[PDB]
């Protein structure tokens, strides 16, 4: 079932999908799936996150604490003094992040956050007072991503929130997924051939029978060639859940990955209360791999999550609490297993990582690294 929001969410939802199907209606009955969801997830004061930003927001202590230490061997490696979050949710990743480096002797000149909407500062800020006083300080928040960079940018659950373009094969070929209105004034999937017929030869290495629907994530690349471009010296790193392009186009992946979060209810239905539900698609690491390569930064590494963290010293980090004090020991236990584990976090999700400037390996890559499957 699917409960119906309060008057005043409503209202704004409502709102929302009229400014929609007044747009459709004047572009000639038709929009591309990206406008759709650029629009819902952030057209300002009504969209999604512009008026659940993260998978497991409670893990983001643990998590930190140890990513902060392959950030560390970046900043040491580049000689750089600086972070840089795009996004950044509720702030629990900033606080969890500064905290721990100053724990382990690193001091930022900065940690910039980049904000475009304007929206999510206030909370981040509130989150900083509360959870890494007096590190606060040091944080600033960015309108735009600024044209040079040096030091460590870090974008967790980020590409999985950027809009992409679904693309059906037809018999005739694939074409374009995009969103019509019906006679009842409901949106509606409708396929259309591309208006570049160029954009479909991109699409023909994919082993697609007639029916196959999925996801391109051309905004997610020009974001990373962007950040590649801006990074001068340090270090990229990108964490969500994906498969690099073999596994992401498999065969009997025919509905691709386009998942929509109602209530914390996972569905398939992007047309549900527009402005009110999360919509993500996983990520496609292997157009991620050559959208930063193809700007001239190296691949610093690609593995999953749980080899990753293991890598990073994760369970190091757990044994420095004792097995007897239950009541820190359990939770720290099962939020670890929760990071690592394949049922869990562990495999689905993937850390990529760029860099400039930096020679040799860093431990979180050094065991297992993947890279060779992109």
């Not at 300002?44 to 202590?61: C, I, K, Q």
């Not at 691709?256 to 990520?283: E, K, S, W």
């Amino acid at each position: 079932s699917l409960p119906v929001p309060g008057p005043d969410a409503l209202a704004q939802s409502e709102a929302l999908a009229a400014s929609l199907r007044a747009e459709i209606a004047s572009a000639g009955g038709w929009i591309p799936f990206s406008r759709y969801m650029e629009r819902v997830l952030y057209a300002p004061g009504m969209g999604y996150y512009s008026g659940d930003f993260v998978t497991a927001p409670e893990l983001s202590p643990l998590f930190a604490q140890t990513l902060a230490r392959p950030v560390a061997q970046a900043l040491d490696a580049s000689g750089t003094r600086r972070v840089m979050e795009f996004g950044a949710g509720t702030g629990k990743l900033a606080a969890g992040l500064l905290t721990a480096l100053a724990a382990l002797g690193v001091e930022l000149d900065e940690y910039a956050i980049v904000d475009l909407s304007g929206e999510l500062r206030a909370r981040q800020r509130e989150t900083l007072g509360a959870q890494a006083p007096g590190l606060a300080a040091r944080v600033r928040w960015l309108d735009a991503l600024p044209e040079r960079f040096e030091g460590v940018v870090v974008g967790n659950e980020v590409l999985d929130a950027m809009p992409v373009r679904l693309v059906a094969k037809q018999a005739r070929g694939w074409c374009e997924r995009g969103v019509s209105i019906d006679d009842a004034g409901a949106f509606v999937f409708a396929d259309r051939p591309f208006a570049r017929a160029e954009e479909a030869a991109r699409l023909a290495g994919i082993d697609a029978d007639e029916g196959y629907v999925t996801e391109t994530h051309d905004a997610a690349v020009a974001f990373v060639r962007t950040v590649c471009a801006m990074l001068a010296r340090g270090a990229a790193f990108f964490i969500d859940y994906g498969f690099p392009s073999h596994e992401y186009y498999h065969r009997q992946r025919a509905q691709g990955t386009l998942m929509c979060h109602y209530r914390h209810r996972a569905h398939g239905d992007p047309f549900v209360y527009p402005g009110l539900q999360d919509i993500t698609a996983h990520v496609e690491f292997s157009a991620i791999h050559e959208a930063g390569v193809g700007a001239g930064a190296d691949l610093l590494g690609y593995t999953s999550q749980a080899r990753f963290l293991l890598n990073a010293g994760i369970t190091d980090v757990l044994a420095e609490i004792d097995p007897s004090d239950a009541q820190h020991f359990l939770p720290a236990a099962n939020a670890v297993q929760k990071l690592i584990s394949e049922a869990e976090m562990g495999e689905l999700f993937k850390v990529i990582a760029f860099s400039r400037g930096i020679d040799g390996a860093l431990d979180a890559f050094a065991r297992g690294d993947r890279s060779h499957t992109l």
